[PDB]
Paper text:
However, applying it to GPCRs without signaling proteins remains challenging because most receptors lack structural features in their soluble domains to facilitate image alignment. By exploring various fusion strategies, we determine a 3.4 Å resolution structure of antagonist-bound inactive A2AR in detergent micelle and a 3.7 Å structure of unliganded inactive [name] in a lipidic environment.
We designed two different constructs, [name]-PGS1, in which the PGS domain is inserted to [name] after position 441 on ICL3 and before position 445 on TM6, and [name]-[name], in which PGS has inserted one and a half helical turns (five amino acids) up towards in TM6. Unlike the AlphaFold prediction, the PGS is oriented beneath TM bundle without a continuous helix between TM6 of [name] and the C terminus of PGS, but a contorted loop that allows the PGS domain to directly interact with the [name] 7TM bundle. Our cryo-EM structure of [name] in saposin nanodisc enabled modeling of the 7TM and linker domain (LD), which connects the extracellular CRD with the 7TM domain. The bulk of the [name] CRD is poorly resolved in our map, except for two small density fragments in the region connecting the 7TM to the CRD, one of which has the appearance of a short helix. In comparison with previous structures of [name], our structure of apo [name] resembles the inactive [name], with an overall RMSD of 0.75 Å in the 7TM region and a conformation of TM5 and TM6 that is consistent with an inactive receptor. Consistent with an apo state, this pocket is empty in our structure without the obvious density of any bound ligand or sterols.
Numbering used by the authors: 195 to 441, 1001 to 1207, 450 to 499, 510 to 556
């Protein structure tokens, strides 16, 4: 009945150490002393309390006005805060009286490992699933947050709400995936306790399961989250370089005051410069590519259009360079039909701005268009677009704004040009007015989609996307570091424990670093705290101020 510390005597055949019959390992990490146990427990308490309180307040803010705040692209972070709140409560459970022994220790006083098991209680499993599910549920929402930001740039020039029909689709995948992982861990009975952290978690006894079920899934969400974030940056940077100020009023390289004179006066000036007489002007600018922009379609349409008697009533201009055969084809038509201008050089932005604001119609014969930002500048300048019904550009152009055609059909395109002539013989003022109003608006007029309203889902969302990414990257690094060195610490732990009995000095080769543990906790709690600032604005204070006035 004798066992030497750190081992204790028990009658459980499942608690005995490798060959030491009757003796198992006490429920106290032998590689750390009491003083640093109290330090770590105090450290956890501070972050847990702060995360719980601040996260709960944000959740209270959303439900205070759920009828108006329940808007899909702006409530992704609400579920993120919900996930982290549950995780925080899971961590804080250990600070109830006697909780650590009931959670970490077996009834015989030995360390819990290999849970679940029918011979012990459910306290270790309950804490494990709460914390682990909360962790994985949160980071799965994070990749949804970045994806929403990536697609939120489609909410310009249209009324269509992206992902409006996919809200339940995300939810089912978001909650199902962490549930599957949780069940997989329980199926292999790898839930182990640790007095240092104060909770049960994966793979303390075997590093391989901790790498598989924690490190690996966290790595994948970082890859996906980074991918969408990178594309979002390219979109946002591309906007500011080319069309900055595509925002609440209008202020860019375009402005109403930059161009002078009437529409006809500028048209006559440009046509004089090109040696052309008055007519209905159709303009296209773009790269002379194949399969991406229909330059071949546009050029072929002119050949078909050349047979009509109305051909002499219209004026054309093509700007761009690229494949030399398209360039030769365009120049040949220029000489064959002396009513079209061909430009292959680099054209200044100043010239383009005046050209866009003078030409009657702009042609966009694309084969693919991401979401149609290139068509918005022409609409801002009063041009009436004719475009292929491809990509996300179909959501911008409507019957009262322009003409859509099937891609690849030069005959249909020519018919659309003939339709443009029918409109051009009448008053086009309504079409130009609709083009400007639509391009600088969206249908989310809950509070006047202006710079104080729509920047929420373009700029503010972007900040939190990268902010969450940073903390999750730190968490990945901590687990990555431990995984590299866990194998040696296991060997050290084995060697250290054996010499303790002294059955006639022991030394610790190495151990897990408490500093890495603190940083990992900081990043985990930091994400919950960081995402709790979404509602830190003046408007929410007013809501709370009036909410308190229910009294
Ligand atoms: C490597 C990537 C994923 C990191 C995250 C992307 C970073 C670089 C992006 C995402 C969000 C972006 C910011 C979003 C907010 C604004 C406000 C805007 O008025 C000016 C640009 C500015 C300041 C952006 C600068 C670049 C930014 C911080």
């Amino acid at each position: 009945g004798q066992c030497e510390a750190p081992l204790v005597r028990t009658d459980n055949p499942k608690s005995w150490y490798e060959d030491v019959e009757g003796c198992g390992i006490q429920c106290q990490n032998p590689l750390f002393t009491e003083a640093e146990h109290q330090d770590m427990h105090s450290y956890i308490a501070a972050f847990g309390a702060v995360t719980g309180l601040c996260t709960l307040f944000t959740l209270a803010t959303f439900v205070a006005d759920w009828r108006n705040s329940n808007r899909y692209p702006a409530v992704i972070l609400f579920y993120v805060n919900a996930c982290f709140f549950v995780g925080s409560i899971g961590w804080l459970a250990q600070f109830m009286d006697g909780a650590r022994r009931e959670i970490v220790c077996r009834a015989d006083g030995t360390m819990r490992f290999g849970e679940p098991t029918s011979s012990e209680t459910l306290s270790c499993v309950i804490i494990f699933v709460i914390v682990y599910y909360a962790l994985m549920a949160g980071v799965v929402w994070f990749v949804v947050l970045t994806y929403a930001w990536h697609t939120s740039f489609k909410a310009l020039g249209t009324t269509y709400q992206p992902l409006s029909g996919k809200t339940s689709y995300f939810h089912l995948l978001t909650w199902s995936l962490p549930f599957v992982l949780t069940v997989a861990i329980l199926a292999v009975a790898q839930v182990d306790g640790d007095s240092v952290s104060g909770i049960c978690f994966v793979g303390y006894k075997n590093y391989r399961y901790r790498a598989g079920f924690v490190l690996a899934p966290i790595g994948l969400v970082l890859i996906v989250g980074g991918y969408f974030l990178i594309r979002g940056v390219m979109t946002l940077f591309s906007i500011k370089s080319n069309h900055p100020g595509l925002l609440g009023i209008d202020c860019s390289f375009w402005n109403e005051s930059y161009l002078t004179g009437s529409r006809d006066e500028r048209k006559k000036s440009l046509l004089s410069k090109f040696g052309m007489d008055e007519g209905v002007t159709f303009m296209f600018i773009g790269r002379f590519d194949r399969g991406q922009k229909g330059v071949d379609v546009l050029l072929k349409a002119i050949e078909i259009l050349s047979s009509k008697k109305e051909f002499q009533e219209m004026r054309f201009i093509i700007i761009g360079k690229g494949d030399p055969e398209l360039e030769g084809w365009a120049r040949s038509l220029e000489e064959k039909h002396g009513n079209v201008k061909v430009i292959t050089e680099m054209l200044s932005r100043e010239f383009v701005r005046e050209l866009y604001g003078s030409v009657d119609f702009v042609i966009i014969p694309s084969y693919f268009e991401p979401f149609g930002l290139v068509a918005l500048e022409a609409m801002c300048l009063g041009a009436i677009p004719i475009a292929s019904a491809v990509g996300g550009l179909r959501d911008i152009i409507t019957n009262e704004t322009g003409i859509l055609v099937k891609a690849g059909d030069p005959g249909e395109l020519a018919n659309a040009i003939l339709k443009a002539l029918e409109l051009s013989r009448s008053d086009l003022s309504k079409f130009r007015e609709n083009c400007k109003k639509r391009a600088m608006s969206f249908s989310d007029q809950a509070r006047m989609d202006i710079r104080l309203a729509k920047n929420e889902t373009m700029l503010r969302l972007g900040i939190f996307g990268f902010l969450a990414f940073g903390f999750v990257l730190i968490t990945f690094s901590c687990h990555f570091y431990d995984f590299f060195n866990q194998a040696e610490w296991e060997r050290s732990f084995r060697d250290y424990v054996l010499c303790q009995a002294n059955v006639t000095d022991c030394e610790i080769k190495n151990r897990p670093s408490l500093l890495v543990e603190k940083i990992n906790l900081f990043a985990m709690f930091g994400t919950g705290i960081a995402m709790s600032t979404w509602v830190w604005t003046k408007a929410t204070l007013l809501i709370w101020r009036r909410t308190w006035c229910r009294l």
